[PDB]
């Protein structure tokens, strides 16, 4: 940790290239418009919300960037990728409006979007697909997402995919936000990969929402110490030019000491006082210091500003960051929260109007008007001149990539559609589908297989020889290995899955990991990924509660599908067979990267268990994509039932169907449910349409179109709700659901399949139980089956076990 | 960072206190038994799994701690809290067996626990409630969990609740694991809080699972750099004692420069070779280094070992960490993964038996026999003698606290059961409930309110002046303010929620935060919390998709309940009224901290919306607990329906009921569903039991004992699956569910509840639609309602919007 003064001495500070006075004129109008936007929304009294004090402390930092650094998307690259602090959006909206990119009506619709012409509270690409790019309001996700974005940009270059060398990734963070584990949790990665195309701009106003980050300490010193220890280039922007001659004057080194020894809380207090308090309490600590401002009007004292408010001091830091190579730079900008708001952080409105010399007369001020710069005006000229010199305006977003990809047809996945000689798993099927894609000229180099240490478990190690491991194992390596870091890998996946828009270069990621450590461990990023319109594939390997049998409690995933079904634009599947994964993967590619360019991403759970893989029934394609199709019908004169299964459990309900037919003469319809969730979504859609169109003929849910009314039983490797979610749509009077509710534990697949009551014997007993209720069979026969199958009717509910 | 040598010089290292010779024998026996355990499970060929290489690399570190450092739970405190690395469990089981705490049958039942006498793969309290304490296999959770456990212990001491001053928290981590953002993302807090009762012990064998952590780097240096930069005391245990002379006679400084410049990849290459190789490639790099070992035989060179394998080196670091105050300490133990296993890294195991001079014949080697030390043997005496000196054996866990608390009665919350004066929200109701508790003499100081920055949003800023904010606002402050760090807040919550077991001091944490950042953001921690038998309350504030109306996409929670229902021992509630919040909180208090000592934790979503809070209907208590109760029935001569609601949407369902009655003559039964999830679970339990007891009297779902068969409609601020989850158990033929499926956006509550098709208007059209279908009313009546209510029957499905 260095002294509590700027990192760059004024002697090494470059000349500021802009018109300081004209820029302040433009900056003040933006400040005013930002405040009017939030104030106008406030007037509605609809509890709309919005922030003001934050952008007030960082406006000048953004201002210098928009005028002298931020490159907009251009013919060569997507420009600088700016991860704007989410809640300073009113300021971004204020500038866009001034640039004529947003209308007055839109600003008046701030935080009112449902009707079509409003603005989102925060950066939400899904809501404003041509404006916002990176979802940052969920603190912590911005810094790590940016780190991996910077890394992915380097990847594109090294692979020779695109020259991203002129792109800088900027993460604008708050100091309170750095407390999130994800904020500093991955910073050593920027050093490892020498990400000199990444700049962290932490706005150090010393306060978070309900108070100061560390009132008893020095947050800027803590930040410096850890980022410096992490090998980052640290630039502290502490004081404005006014301090320059003061420090130069101080030969006793007492100012540095006072500055160094004063704690956050104190500094924050001074800020709420007056020149008198400072000179007395601050400067009054030592005579040597008091004697510096001794000849200072208290108003001269109170005039000393924090470095984050001085453009000249801000410019030096960004110019230096821009020049630095070999590592990432973090700029710690010292600011005042609620800067120039005084009263805050109509009398207060008159205050900021005066404070920033805003061009609004006393006759207009009560109208809370927005300010605009006419064409031909000095301000209008400069505002656009600076941006044009920087390639245009940002934030901006292109929702669809321009190129046409020549995707592999399903036929190209032929070998997977046929019966397998060897017993394999859906994971081996996945790796094989990847290889089919690796032979496709058009997308072969666009594929981005991602791993988090474990490859062997997923039999991914065979790909290493064919495509290599990105290791700037060389800079041309194609597979991204992120180590034991599920969040970081999800971030690389997000960078690749949204590359089609950000860089207009579609990249198709395939991130495979232990399914349990998916939505459960990185769920907030998965939700933000949907916001970011990510188009890619998340592969939850070693899935199913009873299939990853030895690992136990914190590994056995019998619910990721319950977690995944909560994301609107995530398409989840739990295939049982290899031909299904091929059909599913092919459909995803087509939907997402085909001409449709559907803003959706895929989640496919795959297995680590091998078994016979039959050939795809002819014409089963549409059903597989839809989520269900009848596998076969079995004859039986004693009765009829329908049996549904998915994943590794389908194999077991299929065995229950043979037992039922053989030992009980009960026939059945066997269905492979590739997606209980897509089927649930379809039923809901039909029911909603029906409810909304009372005079129209009721639409029939696909699952209801596929199934009949015979008593049904379903079993899967997930908790019962996974299959229960389609109850409303099952056309049978009876629909029993077996599932793996309860905490996992270590044992053999067989022992677990019995414990969780999802094996063949339970399916048979469940099927028999319904026919018994119908009067088709004697209750005694089901009671004997329970006995016959060594089933403990009185063992604790697995959910409780 | 510092030189690549041991932090502690020999002249400063203390005399080893134990019998190294005897200790090696015992250690070798534990090494053997651990491998026999995993190998024996392997023989079963049931894909049970288990690891061996990892524990082989860290065995001596644990051995020195078990012999001279670890304090077992005792009469005064819970002893040292050790977060044992997850996959080295075979080594912990091997020692427990040698200590006579585990039987050979149990070891023989390693990873086969479904039947009663087996052992879990990893540390899982829920599965082995009296053995394991902290769930660590999900990497990253243990380090951050440990930091907040150390902080909580301090908290207990500052608040005067318990002198935890003699307890040390050890987090045994892997170097690969440190890549998880959660691993280093919060190390800065240990310095902030001066956690000199926290010791991070990172096993630096330089490799993850599928390779080195950073082959082209030095993770020990990286680790050292960031931890020291974060203010921690870092102690490096690099080289064994054989290096001392070499380093001491090397006056040129070349050996250090060589050690310093060598990257991890080459170091690892050295251990796969032999002495000759090292002599040429490592020492042969320079004439001065080559000369240090010129007099050595390739064997004497091959014998040079890593510090983490030398008891004397290990001991010095743990001892030194023991006298370090004012901050936490990180011990970087340098080891060899797959140590002593050589080749591997039946009879091929005879190599390790040779390697560690294991006392088992080459004829019995194939039998994979366990080693034990007979009562009276020098080894047996020393093993137990060392432990007794340290208060016994660990790990061990106590499932229930011993003291009896005098919990508040429901009557004590009487004011909350009456009709409320002003319009308040369920969050105000929650804070008021907390205050009732804070007046209880028995539990007032056992309460642990936890907030992540935001307090005023939840009106918690009012408890500050009352109970204070913990600051070691003083050190006796009760409220834990964890800033913008949801994971850290949940870790403090976890430490508190399980203090009843680890310290036999029941503490009752109430963590309130923006619901969206609960399970979605810290779900892996939440799952581990259930594994750790956590007893506390998680309060999801500003919950509901349409209720936190202005915030939008990344804040509007309409699915946290779908995530929370995936955890078996978490009880979820979505109350609409203040009296319900009181009954649920009282019930949870009694269930968890009452005589019942039920291992479950609660999840209550609360609102930021104010509306009329009615008086609790006499006798509604049990129904509120169970999940549903009839609020009232409204008369209607034209038809009848059932209307269900929860949270903030219930009042709109009641509004729909009046509309139906007043505008259409349709009567209804209105139900308040406090917990759709608990009703589903109950129904699932009923049908499961029914299926398993076919000859017996069928069990009726509680919801079927409340509802009747009139067409039903339900609406909640959550996606449709939240209410649809009870379909199977709803006794009505028609059951329409309205929900907030889809991404959130900014707008007014009114506009949002209409966009998400969940307001009174949609409930009325849904109910009327059901009657028209029954021929009960004209289809034109529903069509006109849709018109009357300005409903867009053809707008896009909110899920797709
Ligand atoms: C994960 C998460 N937690 C909490 C919040 C709530 N929140 C919080 C806690 C804010 C305080 C921001 O403090 P900061 O120091 O990061 O930045 P500023 O002081 O510059 O605003 S702004 C905001 O929306 C959030 N958006 N995301
Ligand atoms: C969150 C998470 N991700 C992945 C794994 C899988 N995993 C991984 C990736 C291991 C490698 C351990 O590497 P390490 O360096 O932390 O430890 P050792 O070298 O001492 O074994 S052990 C293991 O079970 C896990 N348990 N938890
Ligand atoms: Mg701040
Ligand atoms: Mg390792």
From Swiss-Prot, chains A, B:
SUPFAM superfamilies: Thiamin diphosphate-binding fold (THDP-binding) (SSF52518), TK C-terminal domain-like (SSF52922). GO terms for molecular function: metal ion binding; pyruvate dehydrogenase (acetyl-transferring) activity. Mg(2+) binds at residues 175, 205, 207. Disulfide bonds: none annotated. Keywords: Acetylation, Magnesium, Metal-binding, Oxidoreductase, Pyruvate, Thiamine pyrophosphate. It catalyses: N(6)-[(R)-lipoyl]-L-lysyl-[protein] + pyruvate + H(+) = N(6)-[(R)-S(8)-acetyldihydrolipoyl]-L-lysyl-[protein] + CO2. Its EC number is 1.2.4.1. It holds the Pfam family PDH_E1_M. Gene3D superfamilies: 3.40.50.920, 3.40.50.970. It is an enzyme of class 1 (oxidoreductase). The modification N6-acetyllysine is found at residue 630. Its cofactor is Mg(2+); thiamine diphosphate. PANTHER family: PYRUVATE DEHYDROGENASE E1 COMPONENT. Homodimer. Part of the PDH complex, consisting of multiple copies of pyruvate dehydrogenase (E1), dihydrolipoamide acetyltransferase (E2) and lipoamide dehydrogenase (E3). Component of the pyruvate dehydrogenase (PDH) complex, that catalyzes the overall conversion of pyruvate to acetyl-CoA and CO(2). This is Pyruvate dehydrogenase E1 component. It comes from Escherichia coli O157:H7.
